[PDB]
Ligand binder design. Structure first.
Ligand SMILES: *[C@@H]1O[C@H](CO)[C@@H](O[C@@H]2O[C@H](CO)[C@@H](O[C@@H]3O[C@H](CO[C@H]4O[C@H](CO)[C@@H](O)[C@H](O[C@H]5O[C@H](CO)[C@@H](O)[C@H](O)[C@@H]5O)[C@@H]4O)[C@@H](O)[C@H](O[C@@H]4O[C@H](CO)[C@@H](O)[C@H](O)[C@@H]4O[C@H]4O[C@H](CO)[C@@H](O)[C@H](O)[C@@H]4O)[C@@H]3O)[C@H](O)[C@H]2NC(C)=O)[C@H](O)[C@H]1NC(C)=O
Ligand SMILES: *[C@@H]1O[C@H](CO)[C@@H](O[C@@H]2O[C@H](CO)[C@@H](O[C@H]3O[C@H](CO)[C@@H](O)[C@H](O[C@H]4O[C@H](CO)[C@@H](O)[C@H](O)[C@@H]4O[C@H]4O[C@H](CO)[C@@H](O)[C@H](O)[C@@H]4O[C@H]4O[C@H](CO)[C@@H](O)[C@H](O)[C@@H]4O)[C@@H]3O)[C@H](O)[C@H]2NC(C)=O)[C@H](O)[C@H]1NC(C)=O
Ligand SMILES: *[C@@H]1O[C@H](CO)[C@@H](O[C@@H]2O[C@H](CO)[C@@H](O[C@@H]3O[C@H](CO)[C@@H](O)[C@H](O)[C@@H]3O)[C@H](O)[C@H]2NC(C)=O)[C@H](O)[C@H]1NC(C)=O
Ligand SMILES: *[C@@H]1O[C@H](CO)[C@@H](O[C@@H]2O[C@H](CO)[C@@H](O)[C@H](O)[C@H]2NC(C)=O)[C@H](O)[C@H]1NC(C)=O
Ligand code: NAG
Ligand code: NAG
Ligand code: NAG
Ligand code: NAG
Ligand code: NAG
Lengths: 762, 202, 197
């Protein structure tokens, strides 16, 4: 009759784990008036990033939706955790989970019902210039998938509902064009959001992968993105939300709009959106397409009442599944919006627990990635130590001077150690343990001298001369570099932040033992110095949170061998990456054609035969590892029992009982510590799936052996699921295991793969 | 240092107990931005406006090089961390640095205690023109008393300074002069402030 | 305490250790299920320190006992399955399904931080049935003074069932089940009644 959509909104049913919560949710929603339905599905004014309206007659409170993916933002009495980028570089599932569990503890204890976290594949990593790529994990669907599973799981285990984000193909900040309508001027009158144009194979094999894992972990909610997909807004894209997400991934939860992600009232209601944010928050300036408008739409007949009931059911399922009715979080106390948007006092609460500082330190020590070492590291007992760069010390205005989003300090301000990035996925910091502090402590234990030049080397009088006079007599000189980037903009290039270029130029001029440490949101340009004979070592420490110095120094001095490895590719040039990674245009309808397909990050590099400086999955230790005895055990299979929720992904081998996520075989290999020091090692497995236009290889396993002593061996193990060895058929619209020869490879990086063998299915 | 630091005013804010939110003002609370020995063989060749950090010694032939400086900020933070507290320092020049005044105004109101570190460098070969504080000291104090009513002042100095504008302001709850403590500046001071040892100098 | 601390050995299950030179030594378990605390409770014998007793440096007040019959879940997470027969079996079902969950609140009403082991007991009705059977525990870690925390007890079908000698299967009996919660097997401020059919 009035069937406007090709893909109808399928009704929630609770799926696997939420069956009883669904039943309660459905029971409560059946009692709701139209007015009440519109209340819970649209944002109201409050202290949190977003707030659902109450249903006060049924005892349903307002829900606090709070940023962000490193923990509760705009909040005192909490810890600053390392960014997703940083746990990714650990390649340590245990840490991935524990990080999220601790974030979850602090979320709940601050009063948060829904965490706007984690970032589970949007952005994934199509461009290495993405201003908020740091908020995610790996630039790889498989590893991002595993990290997303565990990040969701840790959060829900603490009682906080997840809003995994951002669905989907949200791969540049530029022209994301959030909806604003204020003082007459709508964004609709200026420029529509960038349209990611994505073929069906790429959408399934690359972008959806990580979101499938988040759905399976039991993410209670999904945030729809700011970009358009094939010229249709993600937040009212029926193929995206109703069929891809809600039918194929069988997603049983709420889709929440990004703030200004909803551009219309009726299409959104019909095409999969469940919650309008921020609604009445932010002065109503980001659109306010539902609320009283949705009451009007339901009463006059243009929007199905039963449709909106399903939205409210989806919202409440999480409330009841995570026990928030009988174990409600305490009140949320801080004004995280900020005046003049919201005038309101803040209270105070301290939720930092014993063990959380130590966890953050250990994420740092496990992730700091050794890129170059000619023999200067580890340090022994050097007696004269020079340090360079404002990154080695505090923000001169204080660790939280840049404000609620870590983005409001002046362009030239010396921000100190880059412990996190800019925007909604940052957080405040109770202190920063600077590299200089931690280096000085150790210097004092060795009875040594230490001095730091931490000013701006270009604009501060006497700074060049001070560096010239300091460095020649130092036994080692450390240069701390950074590169701030943020939500709402892309990096213009790979250039270092602040005076980093000039610090390096001076450092190599006046010293022959330069050790470089980079705190960064992404890949940077060190081409001018990485082959300089005076640069004896290089490391990337990413975004380590509050324990920056004390996580780093034990690695530098050899108390623990570095074991982190790169979660994306480090190319020699921006021109080496996927082309048109960020489209810059004033065109009304900006387009980004994803003509590269599945070939992003290392898959582009491998396919094009381009050699990166440092490949995906690369990191040195202070010892070496030898790989041997590759075994593929087709006898070691297992039915998939342990997911929280199940997808409905079609696949050719379906027989009514089995699944896409059953393990069909397991692969093993042996590593031997073949050097002079104890060291941990991340072993990686890659599969070459046969076919036309197939990546040379795709990561399908990792296993980190901890503290393997000299001359000892360990077995490394890699369970392989049916999906891990499958392809998407566009024609048949299902997953299948193709025919041909699969190359299975194992080793220490994407291009150091000493073990290979062949598997031929039938 | 711990035997010399001299308590001049105490309205009852000292000794500290276990303050949970701590604000720190003054470049004197942290390092010389060019390094402890940046000012050369006689501690006197740094530019007139350079932020020299903690004044641990004076200028001239009576100076000496330093293997490190244990800054007041380092020592205060160590104790704050032991108390599960938070701590933030504004250590730029408060007059000439963009946003510095606004950072101070936003930080101080919610702090349980606000430490202000001031200094006054003087040297061999010239006499001080007056008692005025070095660098931005006057401005730091004006801002501090505007936004906090638990201001603890610590002065590193080569002599008497002019604190008349603020000495009788009841927002200044304590004043201490620490003279020139040498390399162990911060770790001599903080145990006095927290009452592990009573101040004892005169 | 993980067992009952009686004032005398004579207060425990009789013939607890049998001493004979007889060729075929016998230990008749005629006490039945009544061992440790359920012997003391059934016989009205007062121990010195009861099963589940232990002091803190603070005290805890219990409140707000809730029985939530909508907080149920299929047993999916066990590594292996039994084949224990039960009367309520409908082919899609299990003895270890959680059929309801119960909650209560503890408040640190003393003068120091402390951890509290909250315990749940159930009087399952029937002939010659224990006074109380432990069916839950939850240890709250480091509860600050004045703060509260919710305590959570999932209840499986098995947890509320009896064995039928005649039918040779588990079953949930008819009658009144008392659900008690508190700090020991004899310190149970909260109680409520559940009646199935
Ligand atoms: C954004 O835009 C992109 C680009 O338009 C969207 O992509 C499209 O998504 C569609 C589905 O949503 C895909 O439709 C399928 O098309 C199948 C035939 O595909 C061939 O035909 C066209 C010819 O013009 C061509 O584009 C395709 O070329 C691509 O794929 C090949 C193979 O990899 C590559 O070599 C090329 O380079 C291109 O990449 C193909 O050659 C069609 O068979 C399929 O079948 C139907 O499925 C539906 C839904 O279930 C069903 O209603 C139908 O009945 C039918 O299924 C029947 O047949 C099969 C057995 O044959 C059986 O299993 C079923 O049970 C049933 O009996 C479907 O129509 C479209 O190909 C795809 N295009 C591209 C270029 O990727 C993307 O979705 C958009 N995204 C968003 C978010 O909106
Ligand atoms: C300490 O920490 C500080 C923060 O706490 C740091 O300060 C911040 O530093 C960042 C960069 O590091 C700086 O970023 C912005 O600077 C200005 C601010 O107004 C912007 O121009 C920049 O955005 C543009 O440039 C980007 C790259 O070229 C791009 O990704 C972005 O999208 C944007 O470009 C658009 O705008 C242009 C129009 O003028 C077009 O030419 C361009 O093609 C793009 O057009 C799109 O958008 C237009 C809308 O305006 C539209 O017209 C058009 O159609 C199209 O859609 C850049 O993000 C922060 O401002 C700065 N913060 C402050 C407060 O100063 C500090 O650097 C750090 N210190 C150190 C030492 O690192
Ligand atoms: C639609 O949502 C709005 C916003 O949530 C509802 O109004 C709000 O209702 C809540 C009660 O659920 C009020 O909060 C309460 O305040 C009292 C003290 O007055 C306190 O004791 C309670 O613990 C609770 O915090 C809140 O004041 C009120 N807000 C506003 C702006 O009016 C509204 O009732 C919802 N409508 C329907 C039909 O349910
Ligand atoms: C930091 O120390 C420098 C010297 O190392 C101070 O600069 C001198 O200040 C005196 C006045 O006391 C002038 O007469 C000298 O000419 C200055 N010397 C030079 C070389 O410029 C400087 O004032 C100190 N900084 C602060 C903020 O007090
Ligand atoms: C129903 O109400 C909405 C908003 O008030 C309006 O946009 C829409 O046109 C109305 N429909 C009819 C048939 O009047
Ligand atoms: C390396 O350092 C020395 C001084 O230590 C300098 O003379 C030389 O030019 C430097 N070389 C390069 C390539 O930077
Ligand atoms: C995107 O693809 C279409 C063909 O599908 C092409 O005509 C269009 O111009 C492309 N856009 C850009 C910006 O190249
Ligand atoms: C003292 O501080 C308060 C703010 O804490 C301010 O309102 C008041 O004006 C100050 N008084 C003086 C005399 O400086
Ligand atoms: C044990 O039970 C049997 C009957 O079942 C009884 O005849 C026998 O005497 C008992 N033995 C002892 C040692 O009490």
């Amino acid at each position: 009759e009035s069937n406007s959509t090709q893909w109808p909104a399928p009704l929630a049913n609770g799926g696997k784990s939420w069956a009883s919560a669904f039943k309660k949710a459905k029971a409560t929603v059946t009692e709701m008036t139209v007015e009440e339905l519109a209340n819970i599905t649209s944002g109201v004014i409050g202290l949190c990033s977003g707030v659902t309206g109450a249903v006060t007659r049924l005892g349903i409170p307002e829900f606090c939706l709070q940023d962000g993916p490193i923990g509760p933002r705009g909040v005192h009495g909490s810890s600053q955790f390392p960014a997703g980028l940083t746990v990714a570089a650990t390649w340590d599932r245990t840490l991935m989970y524990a990080r999220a569990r601790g974030m979850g503890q602090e979320f709940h204890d601050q009063g948060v019902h829904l965490a706007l976290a984690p970032v589970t594949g949007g952005p994934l990593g199509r461009t290495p210039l993405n201003g908020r790529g740091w908020e995610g994990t790996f630039a790889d669907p498989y590893a991002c998938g595993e990290a997303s599973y565990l990040s969701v799981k840790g959060l829900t285990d603490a009682g906080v509902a997840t809003v995994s984000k951002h669905w989907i193909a949200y791969e540049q900040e530029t022209s994301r064009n959030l909806y604003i309508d204020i003082d007459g001027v709508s964004q609709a009158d200026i420029q529509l959001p960038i349209s990611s144009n994505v073929d069906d194979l790429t959408m399934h094999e690359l972008y959806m992968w990580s979101f499938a894992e988040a759905v399976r972990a039991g993410t209670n909610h999904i945030m729809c993105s700011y970009n358009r997909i094939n010229n249709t807004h993600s937040c009212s894209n029926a193929k995206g939300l109703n069929q891809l997400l809600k039918t194929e991934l069988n997603f049983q939860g709420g889709v929440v709009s990004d703030w200004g992600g909803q551009w219309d009232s009726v299409p959104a209601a019909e095409n999969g959106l469940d919650v309008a944010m921020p609604g009445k928050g932010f002065l109503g300036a980001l659109g306010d397409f539902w609320g009283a408008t949705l009451v009007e739409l339901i009463n006059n007949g243009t929007v199905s009442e039963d449709l909106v009931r399903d939205k409210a059911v989806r919202i409440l399922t999480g409330y009841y599944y995570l026990g928030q009715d009988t174990n409600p979080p305490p009140p949320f106390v801080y004004n995280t919006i900020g005046a003049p948007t919201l005038n309101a006092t803040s209270g105070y609460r301290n939720v930092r627990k014993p063990g959380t500082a130590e966890l953050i330190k250990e994420i740092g020590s496990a992730s700091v990635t050794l890129l170059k070492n000619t023999g200067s590291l580890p340090l022994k007992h050097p007696q004269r130590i020079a340090v360079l760069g404002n990154d080695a010390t505090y923000n001169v205005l204080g660790p939280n001077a840049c404000g609620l989003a870590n983005s409001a300090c002046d362009i030239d301000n010396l921000n100190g150690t880059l412990t996190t990035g800019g925007g909604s996925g940052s957080a405040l910091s109770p202190y920063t343990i600077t590299p200089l502090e931690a280096l000085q402590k150790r210097a004092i234990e060795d009875n040594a001298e230490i001095a730091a030049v931490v000013a701006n080397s270009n604009t501060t009088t006497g700074a060049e001369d001070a560096i010239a006079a300091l460095l020649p007599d130092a036994d080692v000189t450390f240069v701390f570099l950074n590169r701030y980037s943020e939500e709402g903009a892309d990096a213009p290039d790979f250039s270092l932040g602040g005076d980093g270029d000039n610090l390096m130029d001076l450092a190599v001029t006046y010293s022959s033992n330069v050790v470089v440490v980079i705190h960064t949101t992404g890949v940077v340009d060190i081409e001018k110095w990485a082959d300089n004979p005076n640069v004896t070592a290089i490391l990337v420490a990413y975004l380590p949170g509050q324990e920056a110095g004390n996580s780093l120094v034990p690695v530098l001095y050899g108390d623990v061998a570095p074991s982190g490895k790169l979660p994306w590719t480090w190319g020699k040039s921006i021109d080496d990456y996927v082309p048109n990674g960020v489209v810059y245009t004033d065109a009304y309808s900006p387009q980004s054609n994803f003509t590269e397909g599945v070939f992003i990050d290392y898959r582009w590099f491998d396919k094009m035969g381009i050699t990166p400086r440092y490949e995906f999955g690369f990191g040195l230790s202070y010892t070496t590892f030898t790989y041997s005895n590759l075994i593929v055990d087709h006898g070691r299979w297992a039915k998939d029992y342990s997911s929280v929720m199940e997808t409905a992904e079609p696949f050719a081998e379906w027989d009514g009982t089995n699944s896409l996520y059953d393990v069909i075989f397991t692969v093993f290999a042996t590593i031997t510590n073949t050097g002079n020091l104890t060291g941990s090692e991340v072993a990686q497995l890659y599969i070459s799936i046969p076919g036309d236009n197939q990546p040379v290889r795709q990561l399908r396993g990792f296993d980190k052996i901890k503290d393997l002593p000299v001359g000892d061996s360990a077995v490394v193990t890699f369970p392989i699921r049916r999906k891990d060895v499958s392809s998407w058929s566009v024609v048949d619209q299902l997953w299948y295991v193709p025919n041909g020869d699969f190359l299975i490879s194992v080793g220490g990086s994407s291009r150091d793969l000493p073990l290979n063998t062949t598997w031929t299915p039938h």
